[PDB]
Swiss-Prot record:
One of its GO terms (biological process) is proteolysis. This is Endothiapepsin. It comes from the Eukaryota. Belongs to the peptidase A1 family.
Length: 330
């Protein structure tokens, strides 16, 4: 079987993407943020503290004839930006784009941090990293992808994110009309639970390609591109007037400048990020300083190929017994 669903930017900067997901019987449709950097499926629900909910669609397990409380199970998660949430656990039917899993763990938020509450367009997260990162206790739970793997035609999903435009998540098949050229595959380490891979180098604008190993994760759940300080300094040095700002928390640049592209290596292939993708607009309304889409990973501890990078490519997440990541130009 296969599934296919459209994913839509939540705002005009592509800060995140939401995908409709059907939970329960009869279906309750929630717009979830598909996150290959985490492994929990959690939703705003009828059990979330009423003050922590501001326009989200909530899952109501009591209206689902297929929902079952997973007695005694709890979950608690903290994200790399300081976000957190926690609650209890149901199992229920979950469908994405026509692909249905029965008995999926649905983590119901009783508490959410403030940054989820302020984001009225996101009803929850759908984790697509490896199930070893799932936070359910005492019994760890499988991700939607892991549950679906058996019945998929091919154990893969693909991410085709749009620039200021809708895109597609496909499960179980590779759409050979959605990319150009060949797909280059590259090895994945699952030892930390992430889709972790090694990029072979980079170039700034039309400069020479520097061969150098950059280990990092493919994370649809992270907006920006976080790379080592040496790389990020070499990029912003080519933008007149760019500087690292401690009050803003990263590199900013004059909104009037034009940004060079950024190339990253996948084996012998090259993925080019157009400079326009790196502009995240004014730091405050009316400001002439603009926020850069490439930032240093030094304070994070791991390099992250977030949406800025991934939306420049067609990306294959191959969850075969030896996993790989595939990249193609589009
Ligand atoms: N998208 C989920 C996520 C968030 C943060 C991190 C970090 F910061 F731990 F690398 C990984 C994955």
């Amino acid at each position: 079987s296969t599934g296919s669903a459209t994913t839509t930017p939540i705002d005009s900067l592509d800060d995140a993407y939401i995908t409709p997901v059907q939970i329960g019987t009869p279906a309750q449709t929630l717009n979830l943020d598909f996150d290959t950097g985490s492994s929990d499926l959690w939703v705003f629900s009828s059990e979330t503290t009423a003050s922590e909910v501001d326009g989200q669609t909530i899952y109501t397990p009591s209206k689902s004839t297929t929902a079952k409380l997973l007695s005694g199970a709890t979950w608690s998660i903290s994200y790399g930006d300081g976000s957190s949430s926690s609650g209890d656990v149901y199992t229920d039917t979950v469908s994405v784009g026509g692909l249905t899993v029965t008995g999926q763990a649905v983590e119901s938020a009783k508490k959410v941090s403030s940054s989820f509450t302020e984001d009225s367009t996101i009803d929850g997260l759908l984790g697509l990293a490896f199930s070893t990162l799932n936070t359910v206790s005492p019994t760890q739970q499988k991700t939607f992808f892991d549950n679906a793997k058996a019945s998929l035609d091919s154990p893969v999903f693909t991410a085709d994110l749009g620039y200021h435009a809708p895109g597609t998540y496909n499960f179980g098949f590779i759409d050979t009309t959605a990319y150009t050229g060949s797909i280059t595959y590259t090895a994945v380490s699952t030892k930390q639970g992430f889709w972790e891979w090694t990029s072979t180098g980079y170039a700034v604008g039309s400069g020479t390609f520097k061969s150098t190993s950059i280990d990092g994760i493919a994370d649809t759940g992270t907006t920006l591109l976080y790379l080592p300080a040496t790389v990020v300094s070499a990029y912003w040095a080519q933008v007149s007037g760019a500087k690292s700002s401690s009050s803003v928390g990263g590199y900013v640049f004059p909104c009037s400048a034009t940004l060079p592209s950024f190339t990253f290596g996948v084996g012998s292939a090259r993925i080019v990020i157009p400079g326009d993708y790196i502009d995240f607009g004014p730091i405050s309304t009316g400001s002439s300083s603009c926020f850069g889409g490439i930032q240093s990973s030094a304070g994070i501890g791991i390099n992250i190929f977030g949406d800025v990078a991934l939306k420049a490519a067609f990306v294959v997440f191959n969850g075969a017994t030896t996993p790989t990541l595939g990249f193609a130009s589009k």
